[PDB]
Design a protein around this motif. Sequence first.
Motif, mmCIF file in Angstrom:
data_model
loop_
_atom_site.group_PDB
_atom_site.id
_atom_site.type_symbol
_atom_site.label_atom_id
_atom_site.label_comp_id
_atom_site.label_asym_id
_atom_site.label_seq_id
_atom_site.Cartn_x
_atom_site.Cartn_y
_atom_site.Cartn_z
ATOM 1 N N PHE A 1 5.086 5.712 -4.136
ATOM 2 C CA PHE A 1 5.852 5.191 -3.015
ATOM 3 C C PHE A 1 5.025 4.122 -2.318
ATOM 4 N N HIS A 2 5.723 3.198 -1.658
ATOM 5 C CA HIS A 2 5.084 2.077 -0.980
ATOM 6 C C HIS A 2 4.988 2.275 0.523
ATOM 7 N N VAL A 3 6.047 2.776 1.155
ATOM 8 C CA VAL A 3 6.078 3.014 2.590
ATOM 9 C C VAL A 3 6.581 4.427 2.835
ATOM 10 N N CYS A 4 5.813 5.197 3.601
ATOM 11 C CA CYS A 4 6.185 6.549 3.992
ATOM 12 C C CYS A 4 6.591 6.528 5.456
ATOM 13 N N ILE A 5 7.644 7.269 5.790
ATOM 14 C CA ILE A 5 8.183 7.329 7.143
ATOM 15 C C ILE A 5 8.183 8.787 7.576
ATOM 16 N N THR A 6 7.405 9.097 8.612
ATOM 17 C CA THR A 6 7.259 10.469 9.077
ATOM 18 C C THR A 6 7.383 10.516 10.593
ATOM 19 N N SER A 7 7.398 11.738 11.120
ATOM 20 C CA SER A 7 7.469 11.996 12.550
ATOM 21 C C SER A 7 6.187 12.676 13.011
ATOM 22 N N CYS B 1 13.937 -5.629 3.641
ATOM 23 C CA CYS B 1 13.015 -5.660 2.506
ATOM 24 C C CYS B 1 13.450 -4.604 1.496
ATOM 25 N N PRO B 2 14.202 -4.994 0.462
ATOM 26 C CA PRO B 2 14.712 -3.997 -0.490
ATOM 27 C C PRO B 2 13.719 -3.595 -1.568
ATOM 28 N N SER B 3 12.519 -4.175 -1.595
ATOM 29 C CA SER B 3 11.571 -3.934 -2.675
ATOM 30 C C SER B 3 10.579 -2.817 -2.376
ATOM 31 N N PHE B 4 10.576 -2.274 -1.163
ATOM 32 C CA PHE B 4 9.629 -1.217 -0.827
ATOM 33 C C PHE B 4 10.171 0.146 -1.235
ATOM 34 N N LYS B 5 9.337 0.924 -1.921
ATOM 35 C CA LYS B 5 9.658 2.315 -2.221
ATOM 36 C C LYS B 5 9.498 3.138 -0.950
ATOM 37 N N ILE B 6 10.613 3.583 -0.383
ATOM 38 C CA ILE B 6 10.624 4.297 0.889
ATOM 39 C C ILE B 6 10.617 5.792 0.614
ATOM 40 N N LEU B 7 9.787 6.520 1.359
ATOM 41 C CA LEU B 7 9.697 7.974 1.256
ATOM 42 C C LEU B 7 9.794 8.554 2.659
ATOM 43 N N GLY C 1 0.829 -1.198 0.000
ATOM 44 C CA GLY C 1 0.000 0.000 0.000
ATOM 45 C C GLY C 1 0.855 1.236 0.000
ATOM 46 N N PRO C 2 0.394 2.319 0.636
ATOM 47 C CA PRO C 2 1.277 3.475 0.777
ATOM 48 C C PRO C 2 1.806 3.357 2.188
ATOM 49 N N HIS C 3 1.443 2.398 3.035
ATOM 50 C CA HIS C 3 1.858 2.066 4.404
ATOM 51 C C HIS C 3 2.522 3.208 5.198
#
Lengths: 52, 63, 62, 97
Positions: free
Chosen positions: D91-97, D63-69, D41-43
């Motif tokens: 993007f597949h996975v978004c990382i925020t604060s 997991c090297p296949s996830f598009k990280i943002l 997903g956009p996880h």
Amino acid sequence: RRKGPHCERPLTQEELLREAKITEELNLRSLETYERLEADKKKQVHKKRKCP
Amino acid sequence: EHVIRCRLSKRQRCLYDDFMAQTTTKETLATGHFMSVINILMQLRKVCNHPNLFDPRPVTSPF
Amino acid sequence: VGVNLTGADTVVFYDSDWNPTMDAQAQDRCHDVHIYRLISERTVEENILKKANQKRMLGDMA
Amino acid sequence: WLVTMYEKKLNGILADEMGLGKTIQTISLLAHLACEKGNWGPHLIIVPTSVMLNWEMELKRWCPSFKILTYYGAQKERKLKRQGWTKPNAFHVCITS
């Protein structure tokens, strides 16, 4: 009552998309390894001399 | 995994000895109150930590 | 603070804390590794460290 | 357990003690969802600012296949990153604060 919106490109292929991202994994790993190696081989934290 | 053992200071832990010896602290402990007991235990632990925290070396200067 | 940097050994426990599961966290983070508890002799250190070990065993079996 | 929770449509709380690899467990959950369920997903992942880089590196490692943002930077940089982020598969996975 003259103008109107438009939209197109409704395409997303499950298996072909999985393949595409499994391929993008290659670019991701290349970017990570390149950044790591370039940093380690270029930065080598230090300083320089003054320009007087 | 193994452990290690340490030795008390010959000179400076005379302060620990004297703090445990005086009957004042003995009675304050026998009282049984929580504050007295825990405070005395904290003081003993601190003396067991290079007592310079418990009794620092004062700098000397002429009067 | 987090997962301390691995590859560290000779954990020196300067003073035992008598608090619930203190050295257990350090052992878990570390896991060759070595342990060095600064046991000051000629005192109740022995009995109180036995107590601490009993507390740690109870917390592990709980 | 997480896969069972997902299959039965419930939300999860992982209370494993610190250092047991909850990050790795969540990454493996995402891996399962991506491989067997076809859902990448956009996880969204909201983490403390101190561990954003740690999560990004753990994802790149396991997991090297996830598009990280990683959503960080000034407002202008955030706007630049948001430009076109609504498109599918951006993007597949978004990382925020």
